[PDB]
Design a protein around this ligand. Structure first.
Ligand SMILES: *C(=O)c1ccc(CN2CCCCC2)cc1
Lengths: 7, 87
């Protein structure tokens, strides 16, 4: 459920 | 687990090819949550879901907030050395 970022 | 140094090579039109969660505000490390198909992390190998990223190109990612880590990771170019560990 954590905020996720894509890099 | 053992801390590993993992080199990723990429060009400027590519991303790293990873999703990450975590950061200082969440009390948890910067963790790889996905390795995306066909992108540098998938091709070069050595990075895995569940790895914590301690540093990239000598930039310490410890105590960074989520967005600060994302910014640093997104800025690295060309030859990108990850310091990673599974715990
Ligand atoms: C993931 O969905 C994704 C990967 C790559 C890009 C293209 N972008 C180009 C400019 C530098 C970083 C990568 C977008 C989304």
């Amino acid at each position: 459920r954590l905020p996720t970022s894509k890099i | 687990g053992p801390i590993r140094k993992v080199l990723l090579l990429k060009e400027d039109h590519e991303g790293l090819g990873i999703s990450i969660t975590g950061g200082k505000e969440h009390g948890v490390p910067i963790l790889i949550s996905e390795i995306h198909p066909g992108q540098p992390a998938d091709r070069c190998g050595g990075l895995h879901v569940g790895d914590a990223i301690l540093a990239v190109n000598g930039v310490n990612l410890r105590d960074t907030k989520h967005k600060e880590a994302v910014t640093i990771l997104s800025q690295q170019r060309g030859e990108i050395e990850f310091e990673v560990v599974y715990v």
